[PDB]
Amino acid sequence: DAGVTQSPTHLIKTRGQQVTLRCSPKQGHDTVSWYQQALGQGPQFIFQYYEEEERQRGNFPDRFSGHQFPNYSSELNVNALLLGDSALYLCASSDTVSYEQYFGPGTRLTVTEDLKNVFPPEVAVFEPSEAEISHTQKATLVCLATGFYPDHVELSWWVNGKEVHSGVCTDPQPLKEQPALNDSRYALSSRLRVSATFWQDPRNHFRCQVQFYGLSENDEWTQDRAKPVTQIVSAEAWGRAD
């Protein structure tokens, strides 16, 4: 009996291919609207479905099309993908009493010149300096995920096998490894900060984990390196004594 839902969470496509995103409204809601959001920009209305017919259209071109079914779920189909179709495609669900619209997570589409361009992250953890521990009684680990494409990664930290949030901050945005290239690969850092005494207990185990969203099983892979599928990549440390 849940909230708004979308799939897939992430996608990678080459120019000219076709794509079909799924969305289902919150139980008790029966109207779905689809919007497109380019980075830094505002969501753009594509269309809205009610009672399995298209209720209203935005100003997008023909290659964008939609359906809604009996159970009220909806599909957005796009073909002749263009590079500039890269975006967050969002689904919003609404009832017909109040007409407030509530967004789903989104499907994150990257459209790239070529799949050979795709790489998973290498992940490393760096351990606090002893100088920081003597000076501030605090201990900062930094995690570095690097050389990945595209910029769809989630980075979390795990201490004794449970995800933690306090003392973390991850960069808002990755940075480009050569900024000049259209298809540049990315890096991203996160810091976790804990007290000296916590880091100094050697039975505490610290993991940096990076969920990376890659190719599906559909896609072709000739190359020698391992097909860069969706995967987790991790690095770790244990604490070290005084």
Partner 1 sequence: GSHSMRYFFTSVSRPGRGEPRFIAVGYVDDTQFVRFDSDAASQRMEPRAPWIEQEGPEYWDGETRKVKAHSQTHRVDLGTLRGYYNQSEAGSHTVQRMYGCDVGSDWRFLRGYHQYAYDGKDYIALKEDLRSWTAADMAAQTTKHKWEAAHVAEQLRAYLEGTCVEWLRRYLENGKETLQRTDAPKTHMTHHAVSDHEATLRCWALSFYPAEITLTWQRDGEDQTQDTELVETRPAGDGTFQKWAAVVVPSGQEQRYTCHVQHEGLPKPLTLRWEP
Partner 2 sequence: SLYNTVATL
Partner 3 sequence: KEVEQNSGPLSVPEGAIASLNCTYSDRGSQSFFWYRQYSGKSPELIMFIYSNGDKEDGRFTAQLNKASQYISLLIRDSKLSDSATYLCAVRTNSGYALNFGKGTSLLVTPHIQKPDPAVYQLRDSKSSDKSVCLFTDFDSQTNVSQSKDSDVYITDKCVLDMRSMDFKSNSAVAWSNKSDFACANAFNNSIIPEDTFFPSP
Is 41 near partner 3 (CB under 8 A)? yes
CB of 95 to partner 1, least distance (A): 8
SS3 assignment, position 197:
helix
The site that binds partner 1 (CB under 8 A) totals a number of residues, namely 9
Q: Which of 42, 69, 45 is nearest to 57 (CA)?
A: 45
C-alpha separations of 135 from 127, 129, 192, 200 in Å: 16, 10, 18, 15
- The footprint of partner 2 on residues 88-107 (CB under 8 A) is 96-99
Q: d(Cα 110, Cα 174) in Å, to the nearest integer? A: 15
Out of 5, 170, 211, 231, the residue judged to bind partner 3 by CB under 8 A: 170
Q: What is the DSSP letter of 97?
A: S
How far is CA 74 from its chain centroid?
21
Q: Retrieve residue 97's tokens.
A: 């009493």
Out of 42, 59, 98, 217, the residue judged to bind partner 1 by CB under 8 A: 98
How far does the chain reach from its first CA to its final CA, in angstroms? 52
Residue where the block lists tokens 């935005």: 58
CB of 58 to partner 1, least distance (A): 13
Out of 80, 82, 83, 169, the residue judged to bind partner 3 by CB under 8 A: 169
Strand arrangement, sheet containing 205-212: 162-164, 153-159, 205-212, 231-238
- Binding partner of residue 179 among partner 1, partner 3, partner 2, none, CB cut-off 5 to 8 Å per kind: partner 3
Task: Specify the residue, 51 or 242, whose C-beta has the smaller distance to partner 1.
Answer: 51
How far is CA 198 from its chain centroid?
31
Binding segment for partner 1 (CB under 8 A), chosen from 47-55, 78-86, 110-118, 223-231, is 47-55
Out of 15, 22, 67, 191, the residue judged to bind partner 3 by CB under 8 A: 191
**Contacts of residue 38, Cβ cutoff 8 Å, sequence gap at least 6:** 44, 86, 87
CB of 23 to partner 1, least distance (A): 21
SS3 assignment, position 41:
coil
**Contacts of residue 90, Cβ cutoff 8 Å, sequence gap at least 6:** 6, 34, 35, 36, 37, 43, 103, 104, 106
Is 90 near partner 3 (CB under 8 A)? yes
Is 17 near partner 1 (CB under 8 A)? no
- Binding partner of residue 233 among partner 1, partner 2, partner 3, none, CB cut-off 5 to 8 Å per kind: none
Binding site for partner 3 (CB under 8 A): 31, 33, 35, 40-45, 48, 55-56, 58, 88, 90, 92, 94, 99-106, 124-129, 131-132, 135-136, 138, 140-142, 144, 154, 166-173, 175, 177-179, 187, 189, 191, 193-195, 235-237
Binding site for partner 2 (CB under 8 A): 96-99
